Amino acid sequence: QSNDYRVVVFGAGGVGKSSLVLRFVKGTFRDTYIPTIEDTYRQVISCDKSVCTLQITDTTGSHQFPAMQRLSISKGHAFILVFSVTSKQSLEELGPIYKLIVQIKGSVEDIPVMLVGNKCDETQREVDTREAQAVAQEWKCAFMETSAKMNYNVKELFQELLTLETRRNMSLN
Ligand SMILES: Nc1nc2c(ncn2[C@@H]2O[C@H](COP(=O)(O)OP(=O)(O)O)[C@@H](O)[C@H]2O)c(=O)[nH]1
Ligand SMILES: [Mg+2]
């Protein structure tokens, strides 16, 4: 019997969802020319004095058919909501999915939800760190800034996400 812990990665096109997931799971880059289609990646992790598979779903963002978004949330245990610090529009585009997550799971307080400001290697920002912190405070969720490019806070994101789950004791080690 498999005991998968399922993480779904949401966000607008171009924010770095695929780059975050590939940096974490494979230590590699997103090849621009590979076809844009949902994939799920597997990583073995420690869970409850044993092992389980972390399943990470790299969604296609605004291309994802809404019924498929619903199914992804229903199947998911934890959520990573990625925006680019260079795009205020990308942060705004998380509104609908956050709402649907909270509605389907009943409350933000009952599952791990992480707001992620990716591309924090960039100097021309549209969303300040303090602004993103306020969003997360108002949404009652966690927040982290990352650079997939620089491998900055990439392992830390998944570790913190796993630590937020109170029903299992999970670790990357
Ligand atoms: N500067 C910078 N660019 C990034 C970062 N992560 C991804 N990108 C670039 O942003 C573009 C979109 O990345 P991608 O992973 O395909 O985003 P997705 O559409 O959200 O899956 C690509 O050109 C990436 O090289 C980052 O941390 N910093
Ligand atoms: Mg992608």
Ligand 1 mean position to 148 CA, how many Å?
A: 7
Tell me if 19 CB under 6 Å of ligand 1. yes
In the sheet with 78-84, reading across from the earlier edge strand, the strands are 142-145, 113-118, 78-84, 5-11, 50-58, 39-47, 170-171
Give buried/exposed letters for 60-70 (b at 16+ CB in 10 A, else e). ebeeeeeeebe
In the PDB record, what is the listed experimental method? Answer: X-ray
Domain annotation for the chain: domains and CATH numbers: 1-173 (3.40.50.300)
- Ligand 2 center–CA 37 separation, angstroms: 8
What Å distances lie between residue 35 and 12, 23, 31, 131, CA to CA?
Answer: 17, 18, 9, 34
- Ligand 2 centre from 20 Cα, in Å? 9
DSSP state at residue 63: G
Q: Is 52 annotated as a binding residue?
A: no
Taking residue 128's Cβ as centre, other Cβ atoms within 10 Å add up to 11
Q: Which atom of ligand 1 is nearest to the CA of 82?
A: 20
142 by Cβ neighbours in 10 Å (0-12 / 13-18 / 19+) ranks as middle
Residues by chain with Cβ below 5 Å of ion ligand 2? 18
The response to whether residue 119 sits with its C-beta less than 6 Å from ligand 1 reads: yes
The structure was resolved to a resolution in Å of 1.9
Chain-centre distance for alpha carbon 72:
13
Q: How far apart are CA 158 and CA 114, in angstroms?
A: 10
Which of 19, 24, 32 to mutate to test ligand 1, by most ligand atoms within 8 A of the CB atom? 19
Q: How far is CA 18 from CA 41, 51, 99, 113, in A?
A: 11, 25, 23, 18
